[PDB]
Amino acid sequence: GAMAMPMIEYLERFSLKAKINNTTNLDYSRRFLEPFLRGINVVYTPPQSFQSAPRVYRVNGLSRAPASSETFEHDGKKVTIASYFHSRNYPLKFPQLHCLNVGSSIKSILLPIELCSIEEGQA
Structure with a gap:
């Protein structure tokens, strides 16, 4: 039993x-x-x-802007963080969520907090 909430x-x-x-x-x-x-x-x-x-x-x-409010450009086409997941046939239940600013200095990535299991011991 993992302590992942x-x-x-x-x-x-x-x-x-x-x-x-x-x-x-x-x-x-x-x-x-x-x-x-x-x-x-x-x-x-x-x-x-x-x-x-x-x-x-x-x-x-955390990101100052929610998933749907953040936009990235793939090969000239501008899509939101939520649009990207929606493209994965994954319409975000709450696109108004402030995703996690994770990764690194170079990898500035935003992770949808809904799909995150925070281990209370690891945090």
Whole structure:
């Protein structure tokens, strides 16, 4: 039994003391959660479309803009973080989520907090 808590479930219990919903703007907590997210370890569960398995990442913090509000350009075509996952046949339940700023100085990547299992001991 791994001590891996779903990061949304984590915020429900500890952060908002209420259950995350469509109408809840994560920003109103997530923006202040930076000092906590800055230096955590998440077991990220990648969509099977990527053919990857759960992997722990040291989260450096959080993006100032949610998944749908962040845009990257693949070969001239501009798509949002959410659009990319949607392209993987994975329409984000909450595109208004502030993804994890993980990776490294070079790899500035944003990981959807919904698909993250935070191990309470690793964090």
